[PDB]
């Protein structure tokens, strides 16, 4: 067991680690990235 204490130096204090891992077995439309705003206007020739 790691016996942690507050009076340790760096390199022995407890660090928390998380790792992400992707894999595309074959899905065609799974969770993708997100998006956001951009003020809507009307009665103007615009690129939409």
């Amino acid at each position: 067991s790691y016996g942690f204490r507050p009076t340790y130096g760096v390199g022995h204090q407890p660090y928390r680690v998380v790792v992400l891992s992707f894999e595309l077995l074959h899905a065609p439309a799974t969770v993708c990235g997100p998006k956001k705003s951009t003020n809507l206007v009307k009665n103007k020739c615009v690129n939409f």
């Binding site: 074959h26 899905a27 065609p28 439309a29």
Partner: protein
């Protein structure tokens, strides 16, 4: 009494959840994993 759901006895590794005369029609299809 009125007790039910004797369909299965195992539900492991669930990869999807969801909760929320007369003619009741359905069309089922399965294309590209959908």
């Amino acid at each position: 009494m009125e007790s039910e759901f004797r369909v299965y006895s195992s539900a492991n590794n669930c990869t999807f959840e969801y909760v929320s005369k007369n003619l009741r029609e359905f069309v089922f299809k399965n294309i590209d994993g959908y």
